[PDB]
Amino acid sequence: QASGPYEATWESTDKHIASPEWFRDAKFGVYWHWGAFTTPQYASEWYPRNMYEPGSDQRKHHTETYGPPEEWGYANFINGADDLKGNFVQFKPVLSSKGGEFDPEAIIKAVKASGAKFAGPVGEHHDGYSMWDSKVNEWNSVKRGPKLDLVKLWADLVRKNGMKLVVAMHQAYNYNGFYEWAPKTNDTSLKKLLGQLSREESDQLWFDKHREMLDHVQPDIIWNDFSLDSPGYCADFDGPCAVAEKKRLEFLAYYFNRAVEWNKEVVTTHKHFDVGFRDTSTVSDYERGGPANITRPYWLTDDAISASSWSYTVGIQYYSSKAMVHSLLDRISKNGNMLLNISPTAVGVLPDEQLKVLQDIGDFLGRYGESVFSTRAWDIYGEGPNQVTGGSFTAPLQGNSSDIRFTRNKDANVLYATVLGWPDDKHVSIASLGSDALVDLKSLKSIELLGDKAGEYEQVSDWKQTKDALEISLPAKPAESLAYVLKLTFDGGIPVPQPKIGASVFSATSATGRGVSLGLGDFSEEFLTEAGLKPDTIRFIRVSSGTKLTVYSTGDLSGDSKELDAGEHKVEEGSVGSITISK
Ligand SMILES: *[C@@H]1O[C@H](CO)[C@@H](O)[C@H](O)[C@H]1NC(C)=O
Numbered sequence: 001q002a003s004g005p006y007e008a009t010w011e012s013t014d015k016h017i018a019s020p021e022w023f024r025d026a027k028f029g030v031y032w033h034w035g036a037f038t039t040p041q042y043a044s045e046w047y048p049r050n051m052y053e054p055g056s057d058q059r060k061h062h063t064e065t066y067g068p069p070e071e072w073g074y075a076n077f078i079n080g081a082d083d084l085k086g087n088f089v090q091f092k093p094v095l096s097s098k099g100g101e102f103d104p105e106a107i108i109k110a111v112k113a114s115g116a117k118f119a120g121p122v123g124e125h126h127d128g129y130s131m132w133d134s135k136v137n138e139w140n141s142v143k144r145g146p147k148l149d150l151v152k153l154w155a156d157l158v159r160k161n162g163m164k165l166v167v168a169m170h171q172a173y174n175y176n177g178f179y180e181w182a183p184k185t186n187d188t189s190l191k192k193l194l195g196q197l198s199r200e201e202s203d204q205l206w207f208d209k210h211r212e213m214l215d216h217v218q219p220d221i222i223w224n225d226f227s228l229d230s231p232g233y234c235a236d237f238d239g240p241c242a243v244a245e246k247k248r249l250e251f252l253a254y255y256f257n258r259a260v261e262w263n264k265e266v267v268t269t270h271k272h273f274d275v276g277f278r279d280t281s282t283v284s285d286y287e288r289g290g291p292a293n294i295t296r297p298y299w300l301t302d303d304a305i306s307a308s309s310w311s312y313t314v315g316i317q318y319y320s321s322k323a324m325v326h327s328l329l330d331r332i333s334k335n336g337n338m339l340l341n342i343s344p345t346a347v348g349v350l351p352d353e354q355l356k357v358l359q360d361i362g363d364f365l366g367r368y369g370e371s372v373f374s375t376r377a378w379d380i381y382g383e384g385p386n387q388v389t390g391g392s393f394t395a396p397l398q399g400n401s402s403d404i405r406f407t408r409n410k411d412a413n414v415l416y417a418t419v420l421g422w423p424d425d426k427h428v429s430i431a432s433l434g435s436d437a438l439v440d441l442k443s444l445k446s447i448e449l450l451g452d453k454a455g456e457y458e459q460v461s462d463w464k465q466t467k468d469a470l471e472i473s474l475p476a477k478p479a480e481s482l483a484y485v486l487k488l489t490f491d492g493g494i495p496v497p498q499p500k501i502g503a504s505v506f507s508a509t510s511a512t513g514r515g516v517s518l519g520l521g522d523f524s525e526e527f528l529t530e531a532g533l534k535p536d537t538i539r540f541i542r543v544s545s546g547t548k549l550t551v552y553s554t555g556d557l558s559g560d561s562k563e564l565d566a567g568e569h570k571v572e573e574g575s576v577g578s579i580t581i582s583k
């Protein structure tokens, strides 16, 4: 235990701020799956597991290159050994200052240039190779291979370069089926490496790895992979696909208490499927994708620069700069952040195509940061034909001039509308600010287009509110960019639009003042509160055509519930605790 106000219970841990204000302002971050799992440079980061899979291409590749995995195991990648041709193979990165190709300073410079507000390494993957100076795990990068505390190295470089530190931990699945096809051994060390220790010992080692690392580098974000409490994702291994609840609650309490000692608001994450942690104090992470609508509470997306692996492989191909930038814009439009993974080579070199993606991302963010950083999601994420499918493992967004993504400042009086291309007619239509949206733009003081450099704006040529939409005639195209940003400065806050199929709630006796616009869905009190209007302060609800609303006093839509239909309505102050939109 560590001195703090948190005991290892759910009710104490649930008081932790899941997503602090800095996290909500950071928007974009970068991490790297680099480790002993990159040494083979074949298939995926899951080569450690698949190299023993019966009848796998990995097993065939391993047998044809190094030998049978029953004789030449992954511990040879860690500790060093010859292949069949006679070449020495080990994850032994050499610092470029000592004559090697591992230049961590160049990598951290590229990451800084990308515009990342949080960065850091993968501290430990499923392979059981701790990349810090561990005492609990002798299978680490200090005692073996490069003999260098890479996690401390990356932490020092990330802090020196003015970025928050995230450390990715994927050691829960190490003993929940990752090495299920590896040969049983009696060696207690290799048992530690291959997840063949008693469950109790393995959960204790999970917690101890977390403690060692979080005390060694004091990370701002703890990124946890699956197998915390994720039944159904550990194949057919005789295991619970979970970490002992006691150990998880003890980890949460330790990390939060150590954070109260450091005076730092910290974040820990869980895959949206893993129910090991709750969104009361933890952040739901969507892998290779994100929600299709605005999802509250605040969330995170972890994506990779490649659709195939998170680690480098000969012949790896990468996504485009547009996909990454457009996907970042959609995620931040829907109350979330983006954590992009890059894939350095086994020798510690970042390939030129990854360097170009990072520099294109950095160009866009250095030019339009005002629109992304320190902004919040609006009540309507965007307009356009191009939308993502929804959920994890979905395709990266690639939009065009017909697609708009909305962001707003914290004071809710500036609206950033980003077009995913340049319209050939130099026109932009914002349907949600039309007259049919019951929006009055009298308070609209200025529409600008962001220029070639930050702080350079050009006034819009002309605009007019039609019933169907707000029409905007664009000024001359600025310097080329993957997207173009319009800044609408209002006076007295951004008007509350009325959806065609949905409704709008306001903390006032009329449709005036602060309000939240809501489309089809279920809106908990957490949702409404994060939107900027606590449900116990609502006094007016305006409904669009045939949109039936179900009102609850529960902050979770549970219990006696009254109902309303289309048309205006006045609710007693405190009667609303939840809202369900239907039909
Ligand atoms: C491991 O222990 C089992 C049980 O005592 C034994 O049958 C097996 O031969 C041992 N293997 C090795 C490599 O020591």
Ligand SMILES: *[C@@H]1O[C@H](CO)[C@@H](O)[C@H](O)[C@H]1NC(C)=O
Residues within 6 Å of the ligand: 292, 293, 519, 520, 521
């Ligand atoms: C989100 O809005 C889209 C608009 O196309 C709608 O189709 C979808 O049903 C809404 N959210 C969900 C999944 O309820």
Ligand SMILES: *[C@@H]1O[C@H](CO)[C@@H](O)[C@H](O)[C@H]1NC(C)=O
Residues within 6 Å of the ligand: 385, 386, 399, 400, 401, 402
């Ligand atoms: C934008 O994409 C949509 C959907 O693919 C397409 O229908 C439309 O023609 C595109 N517009 C432009 C200007 O590329």
Ligand code: NA
Residues within 6 Å of the ligand: 014, 015, 016, 017, 018, 280, 281
């Ligand atoms: Na909380």
